């Protein structure tokens, strides 16, 4: 289960406007031409780690995927997260439960005891970057439409963030939850970030037009040390 992702995983790392420049920056991106795992959970939704950060992207049809959980102790021993939707507006609950060994949502098992805070706010794709730094948790997103059914396109897309979360807690692993029709109580793609070095292009009105990965091949190292696109 491995797939090539060409130019996906790009975002706006800062809140500063730049018109018609070629700026370079050193941040946590997904490397170009990488390996993403192909997941289709038809006959599991298992636990996957959180090493630096997680790229998430899915090609959905009628809103099957609801949300995720982030944490590692999973029995209200230490903190954990939960982001779900009630099909109208998004819900953000950082609260401790005991998590099932087959956890999803039913068209359903939560029992909190002690927590900190809470917050509420083939057609198109839902790309998502999850980055956890000291003092925050940022939720970047790219919401683009494509005609291809299963795989990532060759295009370049990078659009504006959504929300930052002042949590200051630790995450080691994570897991995602689905929307099943039945409410049981029984006992999409992923990709990890890496500290690369990127040269980006801003056109007029401050839109990221194309990027260069300065570690992929010697020709891009040449493009990076010349601070240019043409060689």
């Amino acid at each position: 289960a491995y797939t090539n992702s060409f130019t996906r995983g790009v975002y706006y790392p800062d809140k500063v406007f730049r018109s018609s420049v070629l700026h370079s920056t050193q941040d946590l991106f997904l490397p170009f031409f990488s390996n993403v795992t192909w997941f289709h959970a038809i006959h599991d939704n298992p636990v996957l780690p959180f090493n630096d950060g997680v790229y998430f992207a899915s090609t959905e049809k009628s809103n099957i995927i609801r949300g995720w959980i982030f944490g590692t102790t999973l029995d209200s021993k230490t903190q954990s997260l939960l982001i779900v939707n009630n099909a109208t507006n998004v819900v953000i609950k950082v609260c401790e439960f005991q998590f099932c060994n087959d956890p999803f949502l039913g068209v359903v098992y939560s029992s909190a005891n002690n927590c900190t805070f809470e917050y509420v706010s083939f057609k198109n794709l839902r790309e998502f970057v999850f980055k956890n730094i000291d003092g925050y948790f940022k939720i970047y997103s790219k919401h683009t439409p494509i005609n291809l059914v299963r795989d990532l396109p060759q295009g370049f897309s990078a659009l504006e963030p959504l929300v930052d979360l002042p949590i200051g807690i630790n995450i080691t692993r994570f897991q995602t939850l689905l929307a099943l029709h039945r409410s049981y109580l029984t006992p999409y793609y992923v990709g990890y970030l890496q500290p690369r070095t990127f040269l980006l292009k801003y056109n007029e009105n401050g839109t990221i037009t194309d990027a260069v990965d300065c570690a992929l091949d010697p020709l891009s190292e040449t493009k990076c040390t010349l601070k240019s696109f043409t060689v």
Binding site: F17, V21, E160, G206
Partner: protein, 427 residues
């Protein structure tokens, strides 16, 4: 002497001040974290995320209930002009001598074993004595002693598993090389300074952030719309001319910049309006003159500036009335180098006397004024060419001309030690 000179800026102006800030009303918990009773211990220090304040700082450090106010990244004076976007107040109570062990880059038993600041730190350290509060022999204050490694900064540890310093797995037994990690403070009222309990608070923030919230008692003013100011926008300041903008920002782009990493476009924190900034010095002023041995007339060239925008760009109304003479008049001429003011443009052509640029020269002509023309390349001529006609000379001239060439120059020599520090043996 006769020529065209480039003058550095010397004209002075009066300058006002503009302040802009969001709509924020409420106060925030500074009235309880400073006079509380239950302060936390050293190994388990408290942490309080602070937001949405107009909280003053002069109410804190001017009140003399503190003994030490060491403040690292910011000067202690201008802590009430800036926004901080998060504040982390921390609380713990230590011995009197270990207040030095809170500083960035220290040692001992606190900075390596209990609580460690980072070296790149921008906050403010507060400490004062509590001899009449936590001294009965009070044994409720504990501190961690041993760890296998050193403390990474801004992290905590709470665990009771005893030390190991040999190779015996001491399973909760206090023999040799295996000891308990936590011991009590001896706080008797019969000790000197350096042993009484002290209430030590530390703050922490980072600046130059976009959606910054925590900022105190600075009154908003209104805009003055294209005059030189000292603006202040959520903490960031600068001197320039505030102009109206057109840049297509995003739902959150708080400010913009150029190649040189300097800000040029800012967002109004009240009206959500974009303001484009532009400096106001205008050094690019050149003075055409003949010799001062001849006259005292001048002309002024304004470099790459349209003629109708001269009095707006040099800020003409705030100058001397002699400098306003050279800003508009009958003598106004538009060249491709800029706007030339003070010279009477004619329709003739001569050879160049003082070069101005892009084909225009200037000379002092006899009623004596300064004129400006387009320079002539030479006399016009036409050779009577035919396909069977020739011209032969019949006489000649012997002419002697002159040519001067430099060959050598002056042979200097410099004593290094006498120039840098003459006859001083300390240097």
């Amino acid at each position: 002497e006769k020529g065209i000179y480039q003058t550095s800026n010397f004209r002075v102006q009066p300058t006002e001040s503009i302040v802009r800030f969001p709509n924020i009303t409420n106060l925030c918990p500074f009235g309880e974290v400073f006079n509380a009773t239950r302060f936390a211990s050293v190994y388990a220090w408290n942490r309080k995320r602070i937001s949405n304040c107009v909280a003053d700082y002069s109410v804190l450090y001017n009140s003399a209930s503190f003994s030490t106010f060491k403040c690292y990244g910011v000067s202690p004076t201008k802590l009430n002009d800036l926004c901080f976007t998060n504040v982390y107040a921390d609380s713990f109570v230590i011995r009197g001598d270990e207040v030095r062990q809170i500083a960035p880059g220290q040692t001992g038993k606190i900075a390596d074993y209990n609580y460690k600041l980072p070296d790149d730190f921008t906050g403010c350290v507060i400490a004062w004595n509590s001899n009449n509060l936590d001294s009965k022999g009070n044994y409720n204050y504990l501190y961690r002693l041993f760890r296998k490694s050193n403390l990474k900064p801004f992290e905590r540890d709470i665990s009771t598993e005893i030390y190991q310093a040999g190779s015996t797995p001491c399973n909760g037994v206090e023999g040799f090389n295996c000891y308990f990690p936590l011991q009590s403070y001896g706080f008797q009222p019969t000790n000197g300074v350096g042993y009484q309990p002290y209430r030590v608070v530390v703050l922490s923030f980072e600046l130059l952030h976009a959606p910054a919230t925590v900022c105190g008692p600075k009154k908003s003013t209104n805009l003055v719309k294209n005059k030189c100011v000292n603006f202040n926008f959520n903490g960031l300041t600068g001197t320039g001319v505030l102009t109206e903008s057109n840049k297509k920002f995003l739902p959150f782009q708080q400010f913009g910049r150029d190649i040189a990493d300097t800000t040029d476009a800012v967002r109004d924190p009240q009206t959500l309006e974009i303001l484009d900034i532009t400096p106001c010095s205008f050094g690019g002023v050149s003075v055409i003159t003949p010799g001062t041995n001849t006259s005292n007339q001048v002309a002024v060239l304004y470099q790459d500036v349209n003629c109708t925008e001269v009095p707006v760009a040099i800020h003409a109304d705030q100058l001397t009335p002699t400098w306003r003479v050279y800003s508009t008049g009958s003598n106004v001429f538009q060249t491709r180098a800029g706007c030339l003011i003070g010279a009477e443009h004619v329709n003739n052509s001569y050879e160049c006397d003082i070069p101005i640029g892009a084909g225009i020269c200037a000379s002092y002509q006899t009623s004596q004024s300064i004129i400006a023309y387009t320079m002539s390349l030479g006399a016009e001529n036409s050779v009577a060419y035919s396909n069977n006609s020739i011209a032969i000379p019949t006489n000649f001239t012997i002419s002697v001309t002159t040519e001067i060439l430099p060959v050598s120059m002056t042979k200097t020599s410099v004593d290094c030690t006498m120039y840098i520090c003459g006859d001083s043996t300390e240097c």
